[PDB]
Amino acid sequence: SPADLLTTPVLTGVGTDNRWNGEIVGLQPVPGGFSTCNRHWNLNGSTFGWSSPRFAAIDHDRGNASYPGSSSSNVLELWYASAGSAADNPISQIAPDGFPDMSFVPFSGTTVPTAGWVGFGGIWNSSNGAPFVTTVQAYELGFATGAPSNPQPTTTTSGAQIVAKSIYGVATGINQATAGLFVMASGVISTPNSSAITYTPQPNRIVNAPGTPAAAPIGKNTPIMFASVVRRTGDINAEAGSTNGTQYGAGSQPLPVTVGLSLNNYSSALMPGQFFVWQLNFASGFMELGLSVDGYFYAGTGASATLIDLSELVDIRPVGPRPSTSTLVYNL
Amino acid sequence: SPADLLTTPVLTGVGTDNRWNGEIVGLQPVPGGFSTCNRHWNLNGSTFGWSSPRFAAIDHDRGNASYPGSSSSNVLELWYASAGSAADNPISQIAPDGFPDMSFVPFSGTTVPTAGWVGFGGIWNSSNGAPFVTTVQAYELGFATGAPSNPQPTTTTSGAQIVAKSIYGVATGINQATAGLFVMASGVISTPNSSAITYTPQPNRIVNAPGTPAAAPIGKNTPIMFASVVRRTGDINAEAGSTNGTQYGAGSQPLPVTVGLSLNNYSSALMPGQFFVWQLNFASGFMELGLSVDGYFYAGTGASATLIDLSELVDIRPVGPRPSTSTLVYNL
């Protein structure tokens, strides 16, 4: 039974989201639909992505490292490799385990990119594993085409490149035809000033492998993401309730659900066109969430884009398989 | 009942340790005993530490930032504040939530410290939350006395300072009488070359608050830590099985246990002098673990210091309250 995949702690403060590893505190409806594959599992034990259900480090041992010009001090360091080159990843060779599923946001001049996935780390020496210590920085990671001269976003892994670019100047740039990337897998969001931005990533930024099924509304049932408060570079001190705005990141699944789906096969749980339904019991009122065979969650919220606060969620109880045709209750 | 605190996934690949957030893959006996309080809970709902049972970010908004000399390029950046100054931490004002419980390892010259807790981040501007972008680096964090001129390790929080020092040169140093620290809470271990070192932290490096109870052997029952593979700075690419050696970090508890202990009070579970016992069932053979009222785990391994491999652990079953006087079975 899927029932124990989603239990009370998962959405009441313990569970984190499968993209940012942030404590889930809201449900973000997506009336326009979305797709996600990375660190996302279905009910047949499979992922279309390239990441295990954990947050550790991003490591690839063979890419091109460079910086522009004849002066190496305080430069933007660029690392890139081809998607499909992660030979040492048994899940998928598309990208290193943990590489974020977000399209690259280009940046130049004095401009910090908006809504980039950013992680800390740097370049390392492919011949011995030692870091190039003068390249440690915050790096934007994403999928692109056209590197090195003009990396531009792409949202398919097919024909893509994986790119890392420091968002601030490194102490001393490194040019190496073969060099490694090391970045910690729990990210922050790039912003150019103190203001919070929209929930990140927006659907049109998410990178998906060929074959990834899409989540679309079914009647009044609308796909959701799981929202957590995520740090942002323009005001790195900001937390929940900041007067400069609260920043949300979102993921397609609670990580505890992803973990469970990755450990057992649930393919006999649902018949075609069913959700597995749970009831979310608030201090007053309740709502239902439905899980599809493809691993996406739904709420009965129709066209509403408004974040649903989970602070008054008390517990979760399983309902069972139900038709996706039936409107999920939303009675808060 | 404590029974569901420790279930099969906690030690068979899902659970991470409460110091490094690494996947637990071994049990490390500590025949000489140890103490731990940070991100450690007891069975009466309480911690002596200063950290919540999660890994997010370390943030303190008021410390002294400096570098030595009249040349600001490629310098070691130092940040320090007094222990007890974390006013915004409701768990404890000893230190910012997530600050590591390890004594500071001094370093100078061209020397990278051995066995330091290292995290990525930098200094930020107390007046607005914006990072000082030229200070991003890998930083050693620990407790010390004698900063700024001569920080030296301490293992009590009483009268201590909290220190962060970049282990590599920052692009441009910053001198500020009041400045913030931001460091991601999942660390790596500093090493000066490619070799793995002993499990980290060793008992004599762990920083404890006043009142913290110690774990000592009880008959043939010996306290243990939970070991995970942790990255090291001297060979940042090394993972499990590296020919340069496998590096372990250890924590006093599996994080899922810490979480459970922080959410409910278990003080009626055990009578004085009892362990709550679980049986660990391997492909062949079995052993018992016991949990004391103070939240420490024990195994019946006596004087053995050898890491116990969990790769062949299949499942866990609860036994119940038993006298700590009874030798925990070790029959692998």
Ligand SMILES: CC(=O)N[C@@H]1[C@@H](O)[C@H](O[C@@H]2O[C@H](CO)[C@H](O)[C@H](O)[C@H]2O[C@@H]2O[C@@H](C)[C@@H](O)[C@@H](O)[C@@H]2O)[C@@H](CO)O[C@@H]1O
């Ligand atoms: C020079 C100036 O005007 N600076 C302000 C800065 O002081 C503000 O910080 C907030 O101040 C209030 C009290 O006045 C509280 O102390 C808030 O906690 C604090 O906001 C927090 O810190 C700042 C630095 C940001 O990181 C913010 O995201 C945090 O929530 C800010 C915001 O009011 O405005 C100016 O920068």
Ligand SMILES: CC(=O)N[C@@H]1[C@@H](O)[C@H](O[C@@H]2O[C@H](CO)[C@H](O)[C@H](O)[C@H]2O[C@@H]2O[C@@H](C)[C@@H](O)[C@@H](O)[C@@H]2O)[C@@H](CO)O[C@@H]1O
């Ligand atoms: C120039 C040179 O001789 N370098 C070697 C380096 O190549 C070694 O790495 C190992 O090489 C074997 C094949 O010969 C495998 O490819 C290993 O995966 C590789 O070890 C891994 O990469 C190195 C860079 C380290 O990060 C190590 O921890 C990894 O496990 C190493 C070790 O044998 O020695 C020299 O540096």
Ligand code: NA
């Ligand atoms: Na959970």
Ligand code: NA
């Ligand atoms: Na990793």
Ligand code: NA
């Ligand atoms: Na990988």
Ligand code: NA
């Ligand atoms: Na660019």
Ligand code: NA
């Ligand atoms: Na592809």
Ligand code: NA
């Ligand atoms: Na740098």
Ligand code: NA
């Ligand atoms: Na938004």
Ligand code: NA
């Ligand atoms: Na677990």
Ligand code: NA
């Ligand atoms: Na107590």
Ligand code: NA
């Ligand atoms: Na935090």
Ligand code: NA
């Ligand atoms: Na020092």
Ligand code: NA
């Ligand atoms: Na103290």
Ligand code: NA
């Ligand atoms: Na720097």
Ligand code: NA
């Ligand atoms: Na050791």
